[PDB]
Amino acid sequence: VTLTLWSLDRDIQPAPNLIKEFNALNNGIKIEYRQLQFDDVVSESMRAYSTGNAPDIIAIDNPNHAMFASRGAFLDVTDMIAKSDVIKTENYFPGPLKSVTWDGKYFGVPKATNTIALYYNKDLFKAAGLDAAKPPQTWDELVDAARKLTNPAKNVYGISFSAKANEEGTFQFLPWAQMAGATYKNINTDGAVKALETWKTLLDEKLASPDTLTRSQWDSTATFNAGNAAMAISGPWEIDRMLKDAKFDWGVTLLPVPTPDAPRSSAMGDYNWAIFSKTKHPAEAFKAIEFFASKDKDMFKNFGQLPARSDIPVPPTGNALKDEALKTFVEQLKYAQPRGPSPEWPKISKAIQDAIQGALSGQMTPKAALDQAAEKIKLVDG
Ligand SMILES: [Cl-]
Ligand SMILES: [K+]
């Protein structure tokens, strides 16, 4: 049997390397890889499905999963998963599992994951009289610390993050709303408004740069590495550069909660495996995904990517700060929540982006902005 697999993974990233190993097996299945190019995974992929030309297997960005699953494009793998001795749903973090779920059925298997958390400069904490062993755990503590850490004389903002008018702004904002008891289907609760007002306060009180509105997570975190922001909300992808560039002692803690007993959340990036529904070789496609999952234990070591799984430890990385950071990130992943899952996620995300921009620019109040977003979202998902 010959299978086809499409992914954005580059030559040194997991998919093509896993494919080479799978093909080397004595198992009568062979996979041919197509490397998808930037920004095309979704467009090319539902073009291909509509014309009967989809691959057998795809690695799809998690917020896109529900669109394919709800429209019949992905194979229902519920029973296959149940029978598998390799793929066990209890191994996975809850958020990634939810992203492959539609209508009480599994339509894929998580491939990898990431999240965001709160980096902090322990040396600037000490200079401000803050105990570096006790980083902020609530939104109020976070704002208090950001104030104490802001230092115009030395061009330091207390915090950096991203509210960019792209997917990153929604990615960063949604967990705050979720911790306050809101969802994408209900994004204008007074709790969600409090989240957005908190962001507005950070900007208006000069505790976060105005460039928060236009800057990527990566570019925001560069300012933390340079010592111009005392805290940063970003992901595990930052660590190696931070080790090279940040000339200070630093730690990482979970994204703070609005009140001590509030449910935790954070953002959730990266991809899922899926089988296209008209594959002529469903059993063999599933066996390939089982093989990939069986190697999740080696993913971080080999590729520097985190499995979507709670049963796999992060191996020692050779650096103590990196180990501690990743300890926090894997704890955070217990609480990471998906965007959606919604077949109309792109439209919904744009509505939320427009609300963030409208509020933080002062064009609309936070409540007026989120009321407008909720109205748009109710047309398409509820
Ligand atoms: Cl097809
Ligand atoms: K199973």
mmCIF file of all heavy atoms in Angstrom, residues 11 23 69 86 126 156 177 182 222 238-239 243 263 275 278 283 312 330 358:
data_model
loop_
_atom_site.group_PDB
_atom_site.id
_atom_site.type_symbol
_atom_site.label_atom_id
_atom_site.label_comp_id
_atom_site.label_asym_id
_atom_site.label_seq_id
_atom_site.Cartn_x
_atom_site.Cartn_y
_atom_site.Cartn_z
ATOM 1 N N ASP A 11 12.491 19.739 6.545
ATOM 2 C CA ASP A 11 13.293 18.533 6.427
ATOM 3 C C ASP A 11 13.825 17.982 7.745
ATOM 4 O O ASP A 11 13.949 16.768 7.891
ATOM 5 C CB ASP A 11 14.433 18.723 5.417
ATOM 6 C CG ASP A 11 15.322 19.926 5.710
ATOM 7 O OD1 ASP A 11 15.246 20.545 6.793
ATOM 8 O OD2 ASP A 11 16.122 20.251 4.817
ATOM 9 N N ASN A 23 8.876 3.920 6.739
ATOM 10 C CA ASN A 23 9.091 3.235 5.470
ATOM 11 C C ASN A 23 10.126 2.126 5.590
ATOM 12 O O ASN A 23 10.035 1.111 4.903
ATOM 13 C CB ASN A 23 9.503 4.225 4.382
ATOM 14 C CG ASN A 23 8.343 5.077 3.897
ATOM 15 O OD1 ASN A 23 7.186 4.796 4.183
ATOM 16 N ND2 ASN A 23 8.650 6.114 3.155
ATOM 17 N N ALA A 69 -13.582 18.349 10.105
ATOM 18 C CA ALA A 69 -14.313 17.270 10.776
ATOM 19 C C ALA A 69 -15.818 17.436 10.604
ATOM 20 O O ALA A 69 -16.525 16.468 10.334
ATOM 21 C CB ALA A 69 -13.953 17.241 12.256
ATOM 22 N N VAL A 86 -1.539 1.491 21.130
ATOM 23 C CA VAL A 86 -0.494 2.509 21.039
ATOM 24 C C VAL A 86 -1.047 3.891 21.365
ATOM 25 O O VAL A 86 -0.445 4.656 22.137
ATOM 26 C CB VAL A 86 0.128 2.515 19.620
ATOM 27 C CG1 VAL A 86 1.197 3.593 19.507
ATOM 28 C CG2 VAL A 86 0.686 1.123 19.265
ATOM 29 N N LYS A 126 14.226 41.702 41.904
ATOM 30 C CA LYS A 126 15.031 42.030 43.074
ATOM 31 C C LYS A 126 15.255 43.535 43.188
ATOM 32 O O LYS A 126 15.164 44.102 44.281
ATOM 33 C CB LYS A 126 16.366 41.289 43.026
ATOM 34 C CG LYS A 126 16.226 39.818 43.357
ATOM 35 C CD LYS A 126 17.496 39.035 43.062
ATOM 36 C CE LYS A 126 17.340 37.570 43.432
ATOM 37 N NZ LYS A 126 18.431 36.714 42.885
ATOM 38 N N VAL A 156 12.278 50.735 30.550
ATOM 39 C CA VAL A 156 11.728 49.421 30.873
ATOM 40 C C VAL A 156 10.219 49.496 31.063
ATOM 41 O O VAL A 156 9.700 50.279 31.869
ATOM 42 C CB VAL A 156 12.373 48.831 32.147
ATOM 43 C CG1 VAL A 156 11.841 47.424 32.413
ATOM 44 C CG2 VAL A 156 13.880 48.776 32.026
ATOM 45 N N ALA A 177 -10.085 35.476 28.736
ATOM 46 C CA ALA A 177 -11.544 35.393 28.732
ATOM 47 C C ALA A 177 -12.009 34.058 29.318
ATOM 48 O O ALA A 177 -12.971 34.011 30.092
ATOM 49 C CB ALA A 177 -12.083 35.606 27.320
ATOM 50 N N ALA A 182 -15.788 32.966 30.356
ATOM 51 C CA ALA A 182 -16.344 33.229 29.022
ATOM 52 C C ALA A 182 -15.840 32.204 28.009
ATOM 53 O O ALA A 182 -14.886 31.475 28.277
ATOM 54 C CB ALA A 182 -15.967 34.615 28.545
ATOM 55 N N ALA A 222 11.615 39.591 22.272
ATOM 56 C CA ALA A 222 12.938 40.171 22.065
ATOM 57 C C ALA A 222 13.178 41.356 23.005
ATOM 58 O O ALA A 222 14.310 41.571 23.465
ATOM 59 C CB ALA A 222 13.112 40.593 20.628
ATOM 60 N N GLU A 238 10.663 30.314 22.634
ATOM 61 C CA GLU A 238 11.541 31.440 22.975
ATOM 62 C C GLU A 238 12.835 31.024 23.664
ATOM 63 O O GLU A 238 13.774 31.824 23.766
ATOM 64 C CB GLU A 238 10.818 32.411 23.922
ATOM 65 C CG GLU A 238 9.537 33.005 23.400
ATOM 66 C CD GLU A 238 9.717 34.041 22.328
ATOM 67 O OE1 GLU A 238 10.870 34.466 22.050
ATOM 68 O OE2 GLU A 238 8.680 34.484 21.782
ATOM 69 N N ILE A 239 12.888 29.819 24.213
ATOM 70 C CA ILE A 239 13.916 29.516 25.211
ATOM 71 C C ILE A 239 15.348 29.574 24.688
ATOM 72 O O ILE A 239 16.212 30.170 25.323
ATOM 73 C CB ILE A 239 13.681 28.168 25.913
ATOM 74 C CG1 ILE A 239 12.357 28.190 26.686
ATOM 75 C CG2 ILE A 239 14.826 27.846 26.868
ATOM 76 C CD1 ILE A 239 11.850 26.805 27.091
ATOM 77 N N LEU A 243 18.268 32.016 26.071
ATOM 78 C CA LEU A 243 19.527 31.570 26.674
ATOM 79 C C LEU A 243 20.729 32.268 26.050
ATOM 80 O O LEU A 243 21.729 32.541 26.721
ATOM 81 C CB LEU A 243 19.694 30.056 26.528
ATOM 82 C CG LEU A 243 18.771 29.213 27.394
ATOM 83 C CD1 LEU A 243 18.946 27.731 27.041
ATOM 84 C CD2 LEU A 243 19.004 29.460 28.880
ATOM 85 N N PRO A 263 -10.896 28.935 37.013
ATOM 86 C CA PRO A 263 -10.283 27.878 36.198
ATOM 87 C C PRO A 263 -9.103 28.428 35.420
ATOM 88 O O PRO A 263 -9.148 29.517 34.861
ATOM 89 C CB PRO A 263 -11.401 27.475 35.237
ATOM 90 C CG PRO A 263 -12.276 28.688 35.150
ATOM 91 C CD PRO A 263 -12.225 29.321 36.506
ATOM 92 N N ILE A 275 -6.863 11.779 9.017
ATOM 93 C CA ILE A 275 -6.974 10.916 7.834
ATOM 94 C C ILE A 275 -8.124 11.467 7.000
ATOM 95 O O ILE A 275 -9.202 11.700 7.526
ATOM 96 C CB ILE A 275 -7.270 9.457 8.236
ATOM 97 C CG1 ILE A 275 -6.110 8.886 9.053
ATOM 98 C CG2 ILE A 275 -7.492 8.614 6.987
ATOM 99 C CD1 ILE A 275 -6.409 7.560 9.723
ATOM 100 N N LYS A 278 -12.047 9.921 2.418
ATOM 101 C CA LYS A 278 -12.192 9.052 1.249
ATOM 102 C C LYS A 278 -10.904 8.294 0.967
ATOM 103 O O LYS A 278 -10.771 7.703 -0.099
ATOM 104 C CB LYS A 278 -12.637 9.864 0.020
ATOM 105 C CG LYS A 278 -13.922 10.644 0.239
ATOM 106 C CD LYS A 278 -15.011 9.782 0.842
ATOM 107 C CE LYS A 278 -16.319 10.524 0.995
ATOM 108 N NZ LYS A 278 -16.271 11.426 2.154
ATOM 109 N N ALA A 283 -7.166 1.644 7.166
ATOM 110 C CA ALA A 283 -6.485 0.897 8.220
ATOM 111 C C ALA A 283 -4.988 1.177 8.217
ATOM 112 O O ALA A 283 -4.365 1.308 9.282
ATOM 113 C CB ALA A 283 -6.735 -0.582 8.083
ATOM 114 N N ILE A 312 4.676 11.587 28.826
ATOM 115 C CA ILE A 312 6.047 11.627 28.333
ATOM 116 C C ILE A 312 6.815 12.751 29.012
ATOM 117 O O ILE A 312 6.478 13.918 28.841
ATOM 118 C CB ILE A 312 6.062 11.842 26.813
ATOM 119 C CG1 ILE A 312 5.339 10.681 26.116
ATOM 120 C CG2 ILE A 312 7.499 11.966 26.309
ATOM 121 C CD1 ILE A 312 5.149 10.887 24.672
ATOM 122 N N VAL A 330 5.071 22.383 30.630
ATOM 123 C CA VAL A 330 4.305 21.133 30.625
ATOM 124 C C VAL A 330 3.231 21.132 31.709
ATOM 125 O O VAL A 330 2.175 20.547 31.525
ATOM 126 C CB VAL A 330 5.183 19.852 30.716
ATOM 127 C CG1 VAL A 330 6.085 19.755 29.500
ATOM 128 C CG2 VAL A 330 5.980 19.833 31.985
ATOM 129 N N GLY A 358 -10.104 47.547 18.550
ATOM 130 C CA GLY A 358 -11.009 48.649 18.797
ATOM 131 C C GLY A 358 -10.926 49.162 20.217
ATOM 132 O O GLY A 358 -10.907 50.378 20.455
#
